[PDB]
C-alpha cells in the first residue's frame, strides 16, 4: 500500500527520463512498465528494458523545497507510457498515488481521480548491480560534448553488432571515443583528471542517445562505473545502467592515412546549410550523394537528377592548399559530421579522390570526423 504525494511539475520531468528506458517492444509484460517504489525518504522510478535501466531517486527535498511526502511505503509497477501520459495531463501541482491490495493506484490530482491497474512489483526483475570501483568522473558538459561528437556515427544495422556501439578506449589518462558504421568515423580524444585502468568497452548507440536526453546541462559530474557487462552512469540523483556490448571492437587506426592533397578551411554554417540545400534534389530519389568540386577559394557543391534538374552552390573556403579535386560524398554523413563540430570553422582536408577525408575543427586536434568515400566505382 504505497501512498505518496509528489509535486507534479518535478515528477513529470523525473518520470519522462525513466520513460526513455521503457521500450514497448520487450517480450516480458512487466518490463513495459515503470516501477515506482516509495521508501521512507525517497521515491525511485526503476524503468528498464533488459538492456538499459534508469533508477531515479526522488528525495523528499530538492534544492530546499519539499517534493514528496510519503504517507506509506511500498511499491507498484504501473504501465509505462500510459502513466506518463496520465501525469502530463493532470491539473494540479500535487499527484497523490495510493496503492491498495491487488495493486490499483488512485492517482488523485485536485479534482481528477484516475485508478490504474499496476502489476505486482515482486515479479519485476532485479536491477543489475555494478561494482563501485573503476570510477571515471566526467563533467556533464564534457560528456554531452562527447556524446554529441561521437554518437551519431554508430551503426543502425544489427548484422555486425559491434559497430552499433561507441568504443571507449581508456589507456593512461586518455579517453578515445570512436564510432564506426563502416562509412563514418568520429574519434574524440579526451584526457581525464585521474588515473584509470585499461578499459576497452563498447557502450551502445541507443544507450547514450538516451543518456544525452536525461542529462540537463549542469556543472555536476557523471561518476562512470564499469563492470564486466554493465556500466553505471551515476548522474546527480539518477542512475543509468546500460549493457556493454561483447566482442572486440575493430581497429580503426588503419583508416587514418596521411599526406593530404588539399586542405580547406571552410565555415560551418555556410558549408552545413549548403549541404542542406544541395541534397534537396538528390534526396527525393531516395539516395543522397553530392558531388563536390574544390576550386580557388570556392567549393562547388553540385548535384543532379533526371526530371528535376541541377543545383550548384559556391561556398567560400577561407584557406585552400593543393589543387582541385572532385569527390562525391554522402550528404547525411557530412551534415552529421558538421553538426557535431562545436566550432564555426571546420578544417576539411581531402586525401585524393578515392580515400576517406578528415573533417576536423581547427584549433582542436582532438575530434576528427572521417567520412569513407561513397564515390563511384
Amino acid at each position: 500500500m504505497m501512498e505518496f504525494t509528489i509535486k507534479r511539475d518535478y515528477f513529470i520531468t523525473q518520470l519522462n527520463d525513466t520513460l526513455k528506458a521503457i521500450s514497448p517492444r520487450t517480450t516480458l509484460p512487466i518490463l513495459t512498465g515503470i516501477k515506482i517504489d516509495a521508501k521512507e525518504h525517497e521515491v525511485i522510478l526503476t524503468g528498464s528494458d533488459s538492456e538499459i535501466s534508469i533508477e531515479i531517486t526522488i528525495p523528499k527535498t530538492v534544492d530546499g523545497e519539499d517534493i514528496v511526502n510519503i504517507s506509506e511505503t511500498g511499491s507498484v509497477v504501473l504501465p509505462g507510457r500510459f502513466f506518463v501520459d496520465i501525469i502530463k495531463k493532470l491539473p494540479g501541482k500535487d499527484v497523490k498515488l495510493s496503492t491498495n491490495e491487488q495493486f490499483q493506484t488512485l492517482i488523485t490530482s485536485g479534482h481528477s481521480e484516475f485508478n490504474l491497474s499496476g502489476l505486482d512489483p515482486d515479479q519485476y526483475p532485479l536491477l543489475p548491480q555494478v561494482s563501485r570501483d573503476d570510477a571515471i568522473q566526467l563533467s556533464v558538459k564534457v560528456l554531452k560534448n562527447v556524446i554529441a561528437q561521437t554518437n551519431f556515427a554508430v551503426s543502425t544495422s544489427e548484422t555486425r553488432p559491434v559497430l552499433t556501439g561507441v568504443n571507449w578506449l581508456i589507456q593512461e589518462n586518455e579517453l578515445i571515443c570512436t564510432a564506426t558504421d563502416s562509412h563514418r568515423l568520429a574519434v574524440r580524444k579526451l584526457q581525464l583528471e585521474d588515473v584509470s585502468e585499461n578499459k576497452n568497452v563498447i557502450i551502445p548507440g541507443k544507450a547514450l542517445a538516451e543518456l544525452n536526453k536525461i542529462m540537463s546541462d549542469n556543472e555536476e559530474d557523471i561518476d562512470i562505473f564499469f563492470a564486466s557487462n554493465q556500466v553505471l552512469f551515476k548522474v546527480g540523483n539518477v542512475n543509468f545502467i546500460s549493457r556493454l556490448l561483447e566482442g572486440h571492437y575493430p581497429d580503426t587506426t588503419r583508416l587514418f592515412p596521411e599526406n593530404y592533397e588539399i586542405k580547406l578551411s571552410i565555415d560551418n554554417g555556410e558549408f552545413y546549410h549548403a549541404i542542406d540545400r544541395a541534397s534537396l534534389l538528390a534526396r527525393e530519389g531516395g539516395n543522397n550523394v553530392i558531388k563536390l568540386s574544390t576550386g580557388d577559394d570556392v567549393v562547388e557543391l553540385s548535384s543532379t537528377s533526371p526530371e528535376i534538374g541541377t543545383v550548384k552552390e559556391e561556398v567560400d573556403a577561407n584557406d585552400v592548399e593543393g589543387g582541385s579535386l572532385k569527390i562525391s560524398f554522402n550528404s547525411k554523413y557530412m551534415m552529421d559530421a558538421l553538426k557535431a563540430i562545436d566550432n564555426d570553422e571546420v578544417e576539411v582536408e581531402f586525401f585524393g579522390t578515392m580515400k576517406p577525408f578528415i573533417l576536423k575543427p581547427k584549433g582542436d586536434d582532438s575530434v576528427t570526423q572521417l567520412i569513407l568515400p561513397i564515390r563511384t566505382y
Partner: protein
C-alpha cells in the same frame, strides 16, 4: 512504393539527428501511412 520507402527512410534518418524539422517529417509520414494503407487495400 520502394522508391517512396527509400525516400521516407532517408528523410527520417535525416530527422533523427535533427537535420530536418518535425512538421515536414510529420506530413511526409502521414503521406507514407496513406501509401501503406493504399498498398494494403490493393493486396
Amino acid at each position: 512504393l520502394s522508391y517512396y520507402r527509400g525516400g521516407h527512410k532517408d528523410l527520417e534518418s535525416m530527422f533523427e539527428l535533427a537535420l530536418e524539422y518535425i512538421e515536414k517529417l510529420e506530413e511526409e509520414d502521414e503521406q507514407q501511412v496513406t501509401d501503406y494503407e493504399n498498398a494494403m487495400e490493393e493486396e
